[PDB]
Design a protein around this ligand. Structure first.
Ligand SMILES: [Zn+2]
Ligand SMILES: [Zn+2]
Ligand SMILES: [Zn+2]
Ligand SMILES: [Zn+2]
Length: 72
């Protein structure tokens, strides 16, 4: 599955993932793309705060879903 992650500045990162990939996996992939440390990353999908050890399928993240990096 392909997803999009938008940074704080609105920059789009395209990621290739699987349903079973954890949010922690996703965060390391962001770090590789942008240099943003996993411990600085807060991810939201469909207004839900995403926990490191849950999976994309656990949040109903699907093909062509968009996640946001946020402050809080
Ligand atoms: Zn795919
Ligand atoms: Zn696999
Ligand atoms: Zn994976
Ligand atoms: Zn894998």
């Amino acid at each position: 599955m392909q997803i999009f992650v938008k940074t704080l500045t609105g920059k789009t990162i395209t990621l290739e993932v699987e349903p079973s990939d954890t949010i922690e996996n996703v965060k390391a992939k962001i770090q590789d793309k942008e240099g943003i440390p996993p411990d600085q990353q807060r991810l939201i999908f469909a207004g839900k705060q995403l926990e490191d050890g849950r999976t994309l399928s656990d949040y109903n993240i699907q093909k062509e879903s968009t996640l946001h990096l946020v402050l809080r």
